Design a protein around this ligand. Structure first.
Ligand SMILES: C/C=C(/C)C(=O)O[C@H]1C(C)=C2[C@H]([C@@H]1OC(=O)CCCCCCC)[C@@](C)(OC(C)=O)C[C@H](OC(=O)CCC)[C@@]1(O)[C@H]2OC(=O)[C@@]1(C)O
Ligand SMILES: Nc1ncnc2c1ncn2[C@@H]1O[C@H](COP(=O)(O)OP(=O)(O)O)[C@@H](O)[C@H]1O
Ligand SMILES: [Mg+2]
Ligand SMILES: [Mg+2]
Ligand code: NA
Length: 994
């Protein structure tokens, strides 16, 4: 049944053809249970083992290495019996890495808390219904409830389904709907219809929602919807956002593999075209059946050369290091690839209650009468400090401490607040903090009484647990509450009838203490207290009282105001019909006005500053709350989102106002407006979606289950440490200390981490460019293998792996947080940097091939044809007497390759220092800036010589020690790489853009 809230009780009963006195018959239940299903939220799954594994091998790059490793495995078996003992090294090293980087990928995904599981914790196991079977209520399984049955809820129950209220048995029904609105203030329900078909949850005061709980009262209703069709069901469906979207950096890495997989094949085509005269001459060695082993050889070397095999490892290591750094700042990260994204954040959406605020009602202002003289009426106003339920804070007057006890009026004020109260304070020794017991707006009064300590009761020695209600207990020892005239909607006030508990206060006699909506209470007052005296209520006194109350309730204050009063001469206990609330207004007449208290859910201390720091970094902050527009806007001004007098006509909307706008306007409002109130959970995700529609990196901060959808939809969901489990499980980060400042620190961390990643990524990929150039030269020029896949993997995994990791340790800039968010589509390298790295690559591709060709010609260890006939080295065994005159196994010597590898390694160790800064010379920024980089290079060279000396290695790597003359050659062709890059920088740092 849709729109049950807009229908009358009769119509809802008629809709299901059920009687409120009997309920559904077993046949109806069976029927409805077949049509509507069971009243439960469906669990989730899909993490199929034979699926999450296939995903690890879904990347275009990992597939190329998968194929390559296989092709390399076939060439290992179909290998000569020369030394096929260590030929499968390469095929296994690759397969090892793949299954390694793949098994880890399943680890981060298998280990994931389900937000749905946490949400289902709000679904009660049992429910109470009235069926045709019995006349007495039946306590059955909540999941067995169905649309149409008559349900009963009472204090403490967790609402079992979305229900249309039929009849309230208590004076009022109090409901805590915080899971849908984020507010803990209990809402007063009624049974009248709510006309508006587009009404929001907070407007549906005649409905009870599944997952919510009853704070007080008892009522009967009819189930309208169950399962996924409920409000918490909408939250659940939204949480089912399985479609995983990749971050900007991840997107940049995917396009890289795209073009890479193209260039690879493109080069493979070039090679198959450069060798035109291959099968043109009578060749018998190159079998058409078995001869393509030449291409399946280079095809492998090419892939291994282009793919930065070690990149995915250095990224995770860098992110892991960053994650620990943030945890140090009380920022627990649940998603590693989030650290980077947070730094790209341009818009931070934020919940208010419990996130921006403490979610702890606090009385911050109060007043009593000061003087009365005809038309003149002055007041004694005080402010109160503290933003929590803890009895910590002072009462000030003119920003100066005072003793509440000194003012008689305050003594009565406190007495009313202590007695006309149904809540209390409790110290949670486990969590080490004071918590409320009962309603928030009532506990604020309790807490208030503890701060005022009107009787100057000694509380220093007392402990936490004892301090919690020390002053309130003092007043209860003086005046006893005999009974309560519970609050009722028709009167909007409540009172307690009390009498002295000691003959020492006999003069007070019977008194009724009243509190409530100001207007009604004040109208029922005929007197006003002035100290311990009392004078009549006059027009001037009344207007003075109301005028101040009006200011407190709608300006920079916008406080929730309560008027406090006491009937000095109440009726006889026997003249009061206590079971008929409709009589209570009359008993609360002829009152004496005592004072007013003003309270609010206060912003956290570090929020205002945090907002400003965000703004400096070009980061906008938008409030999205389930609370009302008025207080939402007031808080925006308090924390700086809006200026003190800024016009907010079109910069603030309620959920209903927002939906009223056309889809087009809705989209733009999200860019201009900074405040959305009276919102439903779907509104928050909707606005986040709109922001993202403009390709903005948006974050969401929240604490309630009503923030879940939005926390999920956002690129970075940030949850409060003291928030709900649902919010935490749906977020990428958790602020363990609920300190908003941590968000700014996390953003900075994210920008600093990215700048370094942007470096070692360029360093690594730059290296792969040279490696591919080499393979291309030593293939087109028909020269002998200068480098083999086994050699390349070691370079891209260890040799450069360490230096890359060390680059992630570069010191961050100073103006990092003083600059605007970087565009998400910003390319890691293009323009001048493209050409700049286009050259460095060409160089490396020549320094390696040349270092190999050098040994085969001008070296003093194996001279060759100084006429480049080294190209036809292949035709040495076929026609030896041609132009040889030496062993043919010379074109496989370890000397030439070792020469090339030492050039590559040395060039990279030097190109690492070139990576310490983009456009800054190593002189303007010395290498010793990053002690880790230096220590990194040393660990690399040592591991390099390790492969040239430890006998069991040179064999598998096909390498061989070098002379002091050999090495000199390397340092002569590598070292100049620093000069080249140092020059390219100048070309831009002093011309292009510098
Ligand atoms: C790994 C090694 C190589 C040689 C490779 O093919 O990388 C190219 C490539 C795919 C791109 C290029 C490389 O292009 C060339 O070097 C041109 C062809 C020369 C080959 C001649 C044969 C000897 C990157 C690497 O390098 C240079 C030096 O220009 C820069 C950049 O990459 C990035 O922004 C990095 C993203 C992680 C990309 O143009 C990128 O394509 C894109 O879509 C981008 C936007 O990504
Ligand atoms: N326990 C209480 N005792 C005295 N007054 C109360 C109590 N609870 C609420 N009130 C008052 O009655 C008002 C509640 O009106 P109501 O129609 O239920 O909802 P709303 O807050 O949306 O106006 C409050 O603004 C408050 O001043
Ligand atoms: Mg109301
Ligand atoms: Mg909240
Ligand atoms: Na998210």
């Amino acid at each position: 049944m849709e729109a049950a809230h807009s229908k009358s009780t009769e119509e809802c009963l008629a809709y299901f053809g059920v009687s409120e006195t009997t309920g559904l018959t077993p046949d109806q239940v069976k029927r409805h249970l077949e049509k509507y299903g069971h009243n439960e939220l469906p669990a989730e799954e899909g993490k199929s083992l034979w699926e999450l594994v296939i995903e690890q091998f879904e990347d275009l790059l990992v597939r190329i290495l998968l194929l390559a490793a296989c092709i390399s495995f076939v060439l290992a078996w179909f290998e000569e019996g020369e030394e096929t003992i260590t030929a499968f090294v390469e095929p296994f090293v690759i397969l090892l890495i793949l299954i390694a980087n793949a098994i880890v990928g399943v680890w981060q995904e298998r280990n994931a808390e389900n937000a749905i599981e946490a949400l289902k914790e709000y679904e009660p196991e049992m429910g109470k219904v009235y069926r045709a079977d019995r006349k007495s209520v039946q306590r059955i399984k909540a999941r067995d409830i169905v649309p149409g049955d008559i349900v009963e809820v009472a204090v403490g129950d967790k609402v079992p389904a979305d229900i249309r209220i039929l009849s309230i048995k208590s004076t009022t029904l109090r409901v805590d709907q915080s899971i849908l609105t984020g507010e803990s203030v209990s809402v007063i329900k009624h049974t009248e219809p709510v006309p508006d078909p587009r009404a929001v949850n907070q407007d549906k005061k005649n409905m009870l929602f599944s997952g919510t709980n009853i704070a007080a009262g008892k009522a009967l209703g009819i189930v309208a919807t169950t399962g996924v069709s409920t409000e918490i069901g909408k939250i659940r469906d939204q949480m089912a956002a399985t479609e995983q979207d990749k971050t900007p950096l991840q997107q940049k890495l995917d396009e890289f593999g795209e073009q890479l997989s193209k260039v690879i094949s493109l080069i493979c085509v070039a090679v198959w075209l450069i060798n035109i005269g291959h099968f043109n001459d009578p060749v018998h060695g190159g079998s058409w059946i078995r001869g393509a082993i030449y291409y399946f050889k280079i095809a492998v070397a090419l892939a291994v050369a282009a793919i930065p095999e070690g990149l995915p490892a250095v990224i995770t290591t860098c992110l892991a290091l960053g994650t620990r750094r943030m945890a140090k700042k009380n920022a627990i990260v649940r998603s590693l690839p989030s650290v980077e994204t947070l730094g790209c954040t341009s818009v931070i959406c934020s919940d208010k209650t419990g996130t921006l605020t403490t979610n702890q009602m606090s009385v911050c202002k109060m007043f009593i009468i000061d003087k009365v003289d005809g038309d003149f009426c002055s007041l004694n106003e005080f402010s109160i400090t503290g933003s929590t339920y803890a009895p910590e804070g002072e009462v000030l007057k003119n920003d100066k401490p005072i003793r509440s006890g000194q003012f008689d009026g305050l003594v009565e004020l406190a007495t009313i607040c202590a007695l006309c109260n149904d809540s209390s304070l409790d110290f949670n020794e486990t969590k080490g903090v004071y918590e409320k017991v009962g309603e928030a707006t009532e506990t604020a009064l309790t807490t208030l009484v503890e701060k005022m300590n009107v009787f100057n009761t000694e509380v220093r020695n007392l402990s936490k647990v004892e301090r919690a209600n020390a002053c309130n207990s003092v007043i209860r020892q003086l005046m006893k509450k005999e009974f309560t005239l519970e609050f009722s909607r028709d009167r909007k006030s409540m009172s307690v009838y009390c009498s002295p508990a000691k003959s020492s206060r006999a003069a007070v006699g019977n008194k009724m203490f009243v509190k409530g909506a100001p207007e009604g209470v004040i109208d029922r007052c005929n007197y006003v207290r002035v100290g311990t005296t009392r004078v009549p209520m006059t027009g001037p006194v009344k207007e003075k009282i109301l005028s101040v109350i009006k200011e407190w309730g709608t300006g920079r204050d916008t406080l929730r105001c309560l008027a406090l009063a006491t009937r000095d001469t109440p009726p006889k206990r026997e003249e009061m019909v206590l079971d008929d609330s409709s009589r209570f207004m009359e008993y609360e007449t002829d009152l004496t006005f005592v004072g007013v208290v003003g309270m609010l859910d206060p912003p956290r201390k570090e929020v205002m500053g945090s907002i400003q720091l965000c703004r400096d970094a070009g980061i906008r902050v938008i409030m999205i709350t389930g609370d009302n527009k008025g207080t939402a806007i007031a808080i925006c001004r308090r924390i700086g989102i809006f200026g003190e007098n800024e016009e907010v006509a079109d910069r603030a909307y309620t959920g209903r106002e927002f939906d009223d706008l056309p889809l087009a306007e809705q989209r733009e409002a999200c860019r201009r407006a900074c405040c959305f109130a009276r919102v439903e959970p779907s509104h928050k995700s909707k606005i986040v979606e709109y922001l993202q529609s403009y390709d903005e990196i948006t974050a969401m901060t929240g604490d309630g289950v009503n923030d879940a959808p939005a926390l999920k939809k956002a690129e970075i969901g940030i949850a409060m440490g003291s928030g709900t489990a649902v919010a935490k499980t749906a977020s990428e980060m958790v602020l363990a200390d609920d300190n908003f400042s941590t968000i700014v620190a996390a953003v900075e961390e994210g920008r600093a981490i990215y700048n370094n990643m942007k470096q070692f990524i360029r360093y690594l990929i730059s290296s792969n460019v040279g490696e591919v150039v080499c393979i291309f030269l030593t293939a087109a020029l028909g020269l002998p293998e200068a480098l083999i896949p086994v050699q390349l993997l070691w370079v891209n995994l260890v040799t450069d792996g360490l230096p890359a990791t060390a680059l992630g340790f570069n010191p961050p800039d100073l103006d990092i947080m003083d600059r605007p968010p970087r565009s998400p589509k910003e390319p890691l390298i293009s323009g001048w940097l493209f050409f700049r790295y286009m050259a460095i690559g060409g160089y490396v591709g020549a320094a390696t091939v040349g270092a190999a060709a050098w040994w085969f010609m001008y070296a003093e260890d194996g001279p060759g044809v100084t006429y480049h006939q080294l190209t036809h080295f292949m035709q040495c065994t076929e026609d030896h007497p041609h132009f040889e005159g030496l062993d043919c196994e010379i074109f496989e010597a370890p000397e030439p390759m070792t020469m090339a590898l030492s050039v590559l390694v040395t060039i990279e160790m030097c190109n690492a220092l070139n990576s310490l800064s983009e456009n800054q010379s190593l002189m303007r920024m010395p290498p010793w800036v990053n002690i880790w980089l230096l220590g990194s290079i040393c660990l690399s060279m040592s591991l390099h010589f390790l492969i040239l000396y430890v006998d069991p290695l040179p064999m598998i790597f096909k390498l061989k020690a070098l002379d002091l003359t050999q090495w000199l050659m390397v340092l002569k062709i590598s070292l100049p790489v620093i000069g080249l890059d140092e020059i390219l920088k100048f070309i831009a740092r002093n011309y292009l853009e510098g």
